[PDB]
């Protein structure tokens, strides 16, 4: 098992853990802020997903400082994880293209 694949696997696991902790910590940051919607666990999990993917519909979003901090970690984990998958696909294609060229 080559490095770029172990890392893509590791990244994906690590993102799922960030999604779960982020859901949990978002609700804990946002309860106590009047008007907040990010305040029950099921939809916080959906919110962490659509944040990690950078979709950001706008149905849900943090309004407190620490919910916004949790959001940033989730965004970075998500962009980084998907970028690491992209970089692993690059490595696979580049290796395959070496062989196909006899290099």
């Amino acid at each position, epitope marked *: 098992s080559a490095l770029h694949w172990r890392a893509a696997g590791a990244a994906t696991v690590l993102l799922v853990i960030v999604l779960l902790a982020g859901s949990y910590l978002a*609700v*804990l940051a*946002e*309860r106590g*802020a*009047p008007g907040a919607q990010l*305040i*029950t*666990y099921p939809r916080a999990l959906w919110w962490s997903v659509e944040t990690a993917t950078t979709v950001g519909y706008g149905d849900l979003y943090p309004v407190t400082l620490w919910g916004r901090c949790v959001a940033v970690v989730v965004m970075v984990a998500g962009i980084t994880s998907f970028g690491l998958v992209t970089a692993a696909l690059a490595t696979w294609f580049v290796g395959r293209e070496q062989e196909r060229r006899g290099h």
Partner: antibody
Amino acid sequence: QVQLQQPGAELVKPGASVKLSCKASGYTFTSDWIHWVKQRPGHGLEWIGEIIPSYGRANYNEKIQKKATLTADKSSSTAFMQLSSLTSEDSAVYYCARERGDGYFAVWGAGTTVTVSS
Amino acid sequence: DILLTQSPAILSVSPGERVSFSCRASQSIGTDIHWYQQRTNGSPRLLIKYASESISGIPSRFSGSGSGTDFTLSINSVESEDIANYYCQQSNRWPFTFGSGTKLEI
């Protein structure tokens, strides 16, 4: 099973304070919140506050004067509300309720009748 | 904070007739409304969650409908045990709030 257990009654002299208890049984999750709800005679339900025992974070109703203070004892599965400096306006039935972090109060205590008098 | 309006405060119906309780939210709250029954000297009891979802242990008689700002709790064929106060509660925005309640009278 009875999932939340509360004492039937507390009498409190005016200006004094009282700690209300709520011992939980059944399933307890890291995610569970314990809520407190006040009901004055002839009146409706009034949301007072909430605490998450696993992390110890608590929130309070702002719209009403803040006499309360919420703690939990993870070891005893018991949540406490300290109402301090009480008046006749604080005499009420105080319920505790359990919410699994999904927004509704699935189970309630029998409530503690708190009477302020001399 | 979200104000929940329950009106009328009292509802008089005849035995076995359909009855409908109204809950109105001061702004759209999706389907994040739950309904409680409180009998004389009792504590509240969850009847319906998320506007229309059945709770096991609760007679089929009870139903819920609505979304947005207008919500209804319905009893098809009232009977004496249904004599209680009925409260709605929203969990869409913090803090959770309750309606002022409606009494059923037969």
